[PDB]
Ligand binder design. Structure first.
Ligand SMILES: [Mg+2]
Ligand SMILES: [Mg+2]
Ligand SMILES: [Mg+2]
Ligand SMILES: [Mg+2]
Ligand SMILES: [Mg+2]
Ligand SMILES: [Mg+2]
Ligand SMILES: [Mg+2]
Ligand SMILES: [Mg+2]
Ligand SMILES: [Mg+2]
Ligand SMILES: [Mg+2]
Ligand SMILES: [Mg+2]
Ligand SMILES: [Mg+2]
Ligand SMILES: [Mg+2]
Ligand SMILES: [Mg+2]
Ligand SMILES: [Mg+2]
Ligand SMILES: [Mg+2]
Lengths: 59, 102, 92, 59
RNA sequence: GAGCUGUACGUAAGCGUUGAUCCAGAGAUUUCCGAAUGGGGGAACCCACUAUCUUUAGUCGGAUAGUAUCCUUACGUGAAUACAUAGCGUGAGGAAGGCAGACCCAGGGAACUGAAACAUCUAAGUACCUGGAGGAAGAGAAAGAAAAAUCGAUUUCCUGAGUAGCGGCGAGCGAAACGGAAAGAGCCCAAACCAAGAAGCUUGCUUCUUGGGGUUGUAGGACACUCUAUACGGAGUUACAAAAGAAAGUUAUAAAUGAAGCGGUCUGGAAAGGCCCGCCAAAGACGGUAACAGCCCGGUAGUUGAAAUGGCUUUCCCUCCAGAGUGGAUCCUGAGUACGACGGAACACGUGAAAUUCCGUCGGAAUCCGGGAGGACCAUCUCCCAAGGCUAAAUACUCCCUAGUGACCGAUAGUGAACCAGUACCGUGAGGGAAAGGUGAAAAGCACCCCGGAAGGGGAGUGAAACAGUUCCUGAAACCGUGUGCCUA
RNA sequence: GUAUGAGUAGCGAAAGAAGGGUGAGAAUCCCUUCCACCGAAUAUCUAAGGUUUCCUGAGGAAGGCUCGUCCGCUCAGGGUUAGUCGGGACCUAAGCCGAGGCCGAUAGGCGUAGGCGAUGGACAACAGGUAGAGAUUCCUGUACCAGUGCUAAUUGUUUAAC
RNA sequence: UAGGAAGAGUAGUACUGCCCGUACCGCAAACCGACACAGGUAGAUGAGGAGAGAAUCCUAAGGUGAGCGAGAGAACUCUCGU
């Protein structure tokens, strides 16, 4: 699904402006590294955002 | 309808106004009434299964219900009809002079 | 499907009447009737025993009745031949 | 109708089978062409239906 | 309450006052395809397994039930691997798909066009695709609005106003608060703290669950104090906790009764029309009857009516409940958030002096002596407590059902469709898409004679009319004919 | 809707002739004889496709580039028979779908086990007859494949025939 | 071979064997070209005389006489012969 399982942050959409302000449509993805954590009592491997991983979750 | 099979009828309007007779049929779907001896018509028919000789046939023809008034066997005049419940059934009532039609 | 239900009605034409002499009888059956359901149904109803059965499917003919077109029903014709020794269905 | 509900839910099946046999014979005779009292078909069909409904509503 | 077996003529066979046809409420049956769900498939088809019963001397055949996948959950077995985990099987709840071409919330998101060229900009967060819905949705109980005085949750309408502003300061875009109205309704958690357990023993503890307390800014709570109070009372399934049973009234879905002229008279095929007379009216609405009907018919006004089912309201039942003041030592009041840098977006606001809100990546506080806002920012003052949640009414739309309305159309109009219309027809397919109303009051729809093989005619007859004869009221013009008064080689 | 062009262009490759018949009506329909054309086709089968056009009895308004007594047209009745032929209940190729699974703003993309899918592989019936239409199907002879029951002997029982 | 194993084959008898297609046209007037259209349509068989031959000319089995005619024999146009 490409979405952090801790905090549900995903890809969004927006403009990519230049000089003279021509508008081109781009996207802002998010840091989703693949790690192994305890989704339930039994461990598994899922996507976790880098920022949500900076403090609190075990590996 | 207010007129059923077998009653006595005095017509009131049309080419054949003023005469009287019985009724031999009624068509509630079409609001028509067939009265014997009234509104006689000529039919040109070929020889067939019944009437195997054809010829000109003279029969009645239905007329509209509105051209009909009931005739009372107790009094004998064209009357509008009311209703009353005698015993545990509803009966028609001559709502002109008060006598029960049946 | 009941034994009375499977067998609809006899087909009485010149051909069927011409073939009745050779112990062959023509019937209508359910559109969903096997070649053996018919055999057992006939054995149950007319109280004989059957040698062979042959079935054939007839499509719907196209007919018109004035600005209106449609297809007649769909038939399933069967021919029951009966053994050397057994009664003969009357038909009459 | 009510002439039926006073039967022990067993003989009514016997009447039903008998009516089915009579109906089939009537249809057979009509197919041959030697039937004139065609109202019998409707009479028997209605009777079979009545008895089937009584059977079903008995439970 | 007397006829009925639809359209639709019919012939045949039948049924009805023991009460038919018909009308309304509630039930049973409901083949096959279709999410289609036992497997497969080219739509309405083919082929099974496991149990139970049945048929034949047996093979052959027949009925009944179950058998898809996914999510949550209970139990049993259980791999590399010792314990266990993965997996496997059974059991119980739930989902799937449709649409009303309308309404509205989110994700994504154009160009033609305007600028008299065109790129910033507008067109527009419009069309369109996708997801989630509910009868409404969204918003909502102040980290608010505002200033020498104050208000007091949200939404919609009237003005504020084409104002303040934004803007190749071009084309153009365009507010809010104050004021007046419709409607009005408030609440529930987290945190300390009390008790219990289980688990990790991070091991004299921590950490998870359950029960109780408690939620606010002139600070509140915990904690200590007294007072009353446990059904005395209050409250409710629309938020505030949730699940049922009733009774009464009322309403919706069939209906009953319902006054007054057969008046005379002229025309006419026929009177409802003209003339001369009478009557009812809480009824002179509408339609039909051989022409224009208050008094001929169905009816209308008024007054009655429900065995059965659904809606609604009041009450019973049922269920649930502590709220006052004082100290306020010590503790709590939402953490990788609020903010900041960078890059974008929405706010009327195009990065500008740019407050306010959201997104992605990085950096990263205080914590009641605290925190935020008042269009950069600092001091003072004023107002208010974010980073958890729920909430009716005033609002938007009509696929539909009941009753009506129109200085709205009247067959080339009005829906594409007044007629067996999304049909006939066109296309491989998505898709496009017509033409076609009128006999007569009543079929009384031309018996019979003559010409002809029929078709079609000429008489006769029905009819007020047949120059109304199964495209049948009226029947114009272009177009095609016969006769003839005047002129013409 | 109806005209002018106009009673004009056209009537879509090809040998017909006569005598009888039916009929209100015959160059065009039926029969007979002569003649002529194709003959690695203009002959005989069977696929795809079409969907009743097939046969019998009636009909001549419209269709047929004329006529029509006729017809692939109108009306009413009929007609297609399988253990062995072709296809399912057998098998797979190209290709397609695809439990879990990987990937991705939504939708969905790719794909494992598995399953579909002949144009191929496998598999037992031949010759005759039938004047309205069916024939390896119906009928007469003769056959073959798979299975069941039943009669008769034969054979084996856990150092175990099969 | 793994495995199942109290039934097994043998001979003869009689019995049993489902669904779908089955008419008709199929180098054509019935299929694809708006038409009863000089076009297109896969495969099997495809005889004789002369001939190497499925070439060519005339024929067999078999199939047809082509859905407007009759009558005159000008110009001109087209297909042909000297
Ligand atoms: Mg299924
Ligand atoms: Mg421009
Ligand atoms: Mg809401
Ligand atoms: Mg008139
Ligand atoms: Mg807070
Ligand atoms: Mg119209
Ligand atoms: Mg002169
Ligand atoms: Mg000319
Ligand atoms: Mg000329
Ligand atoms: Mg020709
Ligand atoms: Mg030749
Ligand atoms: Mg034919
Ligand atoms: Mg003709
Ligand atoms: Mg054939
Ligand atoms: Mg040769
Ligand atoms: Mg040659």
């Amino acid at each position: 699904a490409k979405e952090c399982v801790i905090t549900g942050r995903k890809s969004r959409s927006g403009n990519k402006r230049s000089h003279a302000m021509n508008s081109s449509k781009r996207t802002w993805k998010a840091n989703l590294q693949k790690v192994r954590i305890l989704v339930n009592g039994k461990p598994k491997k899922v996507w976790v955002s880098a920022r949500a991983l900076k403090s609190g979750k075990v590996e | 309808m207010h007129v059923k099979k077998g009653d006595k009828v005095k017509v009131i309007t049309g080419k054949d106004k003023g005469k009287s007779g019985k009724v031999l049929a009624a068509f509630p779907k079409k609001d028509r009434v067939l009265i014997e001896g009234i509104n006689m018509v000529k039919k040109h028919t070929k020889p067939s299964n019944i009437n195997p000789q054809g010829g000109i046939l003279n029969v009645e023809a239905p007329i509209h219900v509105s051209n009909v008034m009931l005739i009372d066997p107790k009094t004998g005049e064209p009357t509008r009809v009311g209703y009353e419940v005698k015993g545990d059934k509803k009966v028609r009532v001559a709502k002109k002079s008060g006598e029960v039609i049946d | 499907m009941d034994a009375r239900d499977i067998i609809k009605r006899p087909v009485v034409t010149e051909e069927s009447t011409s073939i009745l002499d050779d112990k062959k009888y023509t019937f209508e059956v359910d559109t969903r009737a096997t070649k053996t359901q018919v055999k057992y149904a006939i054995e149950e109803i007319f109280d004989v025993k059957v040698a062979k059965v042959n079935v054939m499917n007839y499509k719907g003919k196209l007919k018109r009745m004035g600005r209106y077109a449609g297809y007649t029903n769909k038939r399933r014709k069967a021919i029951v031949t009966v053994t050397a020794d057994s009664k003969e269905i009357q038909f009459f | 109708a009510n002439d039926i509900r006073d039967l022990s839910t067993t003989e009514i099946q016997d009447q039903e089978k008998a009516l089915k046999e009579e109906l089939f014979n009537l249809r057979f005779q009509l197919a041959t062409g030697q039937l004139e009292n065609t109202a019998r078909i409707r009479e028997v069909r209605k009777a079979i239906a009545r008895m089937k409904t009584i059977v079903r509503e008995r439970e």
